[PDB]
Design a binder for this molecule. Structure first.
Ligand SMILES: [Ca+2]
Length: 572
């Protein structure tokens, strides 16, 4: 099982023992980073290098003729880790490290190349920006998962947006960005520095030269990939040709002069189909090498063939997709740990790049980031649920099943203004529906469904109490602790309701008081944890579990009220 799935893979159904002694060749001309990654994993011959080096002269024919492609041959004879370019060798080494298990290697032959040219993440979400260490871990994760594009565009940074983009970075923040670029180059990831100079910027001669000066400064810091954002810029510079001429100018002056500029991206004022003459002029009057960002048919929507062919006509170039998942700046009381799906699996040629907008929690976003890194590399072989489970195991192997059980019930976004929903709590939904139908009409409940609900609530309690004390991935646990508390409380309330449907009178009253106390606990967590201006509080399992619990509670409470002339408060 390899991730992301390679294009062509041949397995010989036989294993090869570890070479205790080896004679590696080509280390002086291959990628030094891949050389270090290889030596950290360490007679038998091992050849490694980019196409054209003497070490891989024998295997230049088998190299895929695509950027970031590689050829990896492990057999009884020797080992070949050849790459189409310097980044392809690093990706080959990542796949090779995936192949190694307990010092044994399968006899395989792999030819690989990315399906989408640019793949990665953009840190454009509203809310608390990531820490420096979190960004370093994210860069290393991207490098391990064959992602190449990280767009540094945090909304709460004054030096890349209005009005301080003209200012140089302070020496300390400049050193921080320098170490970011250093780690990115160490793991072969394009640090795309974003800038958004809008705010009603009527064009002139000063501001453009200040843009060029800031670009030269960031180049002095080591940045080699840049992007200009007009994302709903309220500027009167929503004029199409003004933006087109500005981007053409910065390409004509800064890109052609500088030797190793990699990416040049721009985001139009209209980045979705619902917010629309503008994109046509943009695509006609822009340089061919510059990319144009896009988010889909809506502000937060999936990518369909009719949703991409409709735009690729206007911009006259392959789109640079910007998916808004699992970003939760519009519903941050919920967790979005559901699987990545909905995008068509056969539109790789219709887009230049695919970048995801993640949550304010990085380790929690790693699930969808892993899924996108697999899908953006090979949409034809993108297994949705298997990749989701593989991401869960990769992030927390010690508690893979527990994190799986938790994420299964934290997927839906709940009601919101964008109308974006996610499927959640599916495997138990038929049991919940059958049980609520059996008790809503006063009939007899199915026993198998009762045992299933017991098992689910017990497993929720177990998974919550296991996740609370995990230390293998501490940042993740620190991110999801309040939601795990609410999850455990929901499991306990459901367990007590399941004991309430099997009644004497005093036992029922005790369980009723217990359920009320648990609702108070939930309100306390809602009013204390995750306090933000827009969507404060903590919510979990709101798709199936919470409605089922509330409805069963109300049903049994009304039955008791009409059976004993009581007037219990069934409000939740
Ligand atoms: Ca070389």
């Amino acid at each position: 099982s390899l991730q992301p799935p390679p294009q062509q893979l041949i397995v010989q159904n036989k294993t090869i023992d570890l070479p205790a002694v080896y004679q590696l060749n080509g280390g002086e001309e291959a990628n030094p980073h891949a050389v270090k990654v290889l030596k950290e994993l360490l007679g038998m011959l091992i050849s490694i290098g980019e196409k054209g080096d003497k070490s891989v002269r024998k295997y230049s024919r088998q190299i895929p003729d695509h950027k970031e492609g590689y050829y990896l041959s492990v057999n009884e004879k020797e080992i070949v880790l050849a790459g189409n370019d310097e980044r392809g060798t690093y990706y080959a080494l990542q796949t090779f490290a995936q192949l190694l298990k307990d010092g044994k290697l399968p006899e395989v032959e792999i030819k690989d190349y990315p399906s989408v040219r640019y793949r990665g993440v953009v840190e454009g979400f509203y809310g608390t920006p990531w820490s420096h260490q979190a960004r370093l871990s994210q860069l290393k994760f991207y490098g391990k998962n064959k992602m190449n594009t990280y767009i540094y565009g945090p909304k709460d940074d004054p030096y890349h947006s209005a009005p301080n983009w003209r200012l140089p970075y302070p020496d300390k923040e400049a050193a921080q960005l320098q170490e970011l670029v250093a780690v990115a180059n160490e793991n072969e990831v394009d640090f795309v520095w974003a800038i958004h100079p809008g705010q009603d910027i009527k064009w002139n001669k000063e501001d453009r030269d200040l843009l060029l000066a800031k670009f030269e400064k960031m180049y002095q810091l080591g940045v080699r990939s840049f992007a200009v954002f007009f994302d709903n810029i309220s500027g009167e510079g929503t004029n199409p040709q003004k933006q087109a001429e500005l981007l053409n100018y910065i390409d004509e002056k800064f890109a052609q002069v500088k030797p190793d500029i990699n990416q040049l991206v721009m985001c139009p004022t209209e980045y979705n189909k619902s917010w629309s003459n503008y994109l046509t002029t943009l695509g006609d009057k822009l340089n061919p090498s510059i990319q144009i960002m896009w988010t889909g048919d809506r502000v937060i929507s999936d990518i369909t063939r009719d949703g991409i062919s409709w735009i690729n006509e206007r911009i006259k170039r392959p789109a640079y997709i910007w998916w808004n998942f699992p970003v939760s700046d519009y519903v941050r009381d919920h967790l979005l740990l559901g699987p990545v799906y909905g995008n068509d699996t056969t539109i790789a040629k219709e887009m230049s790049g695919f970048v995801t907008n993640p949550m304010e929690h990085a380790e929690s976003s790693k699930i969808a980031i892993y899924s996108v890194a697999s899908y953006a590399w090979n949409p034809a072989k993108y297994d949705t649920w298997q990749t989701w489970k593989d991401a869960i195991r990769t992030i927390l192997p010690s508690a893979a099943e527990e994190l799986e059980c938790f994420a299964m019930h934290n997927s839906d976004l709940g009601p919101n203004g964008h109308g974006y929903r996610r499927e959640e709590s599916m495997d138990i939904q038929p049991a919940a529906e059958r049980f609520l139908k059996a008790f809503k009409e006063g009939k007899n409940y199915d026993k198998a469904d009762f045992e299933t609900l017991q098992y689910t609530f017990e497993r929720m309690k177990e998974s919550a109490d296991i996740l609370l004390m995990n230390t293998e991935n501490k940042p993740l646990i620190v991110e999801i602790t309040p939601w795990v508390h609410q999850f455990k409380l929901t499991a306990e309330m459901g367990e007590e309701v399941l004991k309430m449907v099997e009644g004497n009178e005093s036992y029922f009253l005790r369980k009723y008081n217990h359920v009320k106390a648990l609702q108070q606990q939930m309100f306390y967590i809602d009013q204390t944890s995750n306090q933000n201006p827009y969507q404060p509080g903590v919510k979990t399992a709101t798709r199936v579990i919470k409605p089922l619990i509330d409805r069963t509670f109300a049903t049994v409470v009304k039955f008791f009220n009409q059976k004993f002339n009581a007037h219990l408060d069934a409000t939740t």
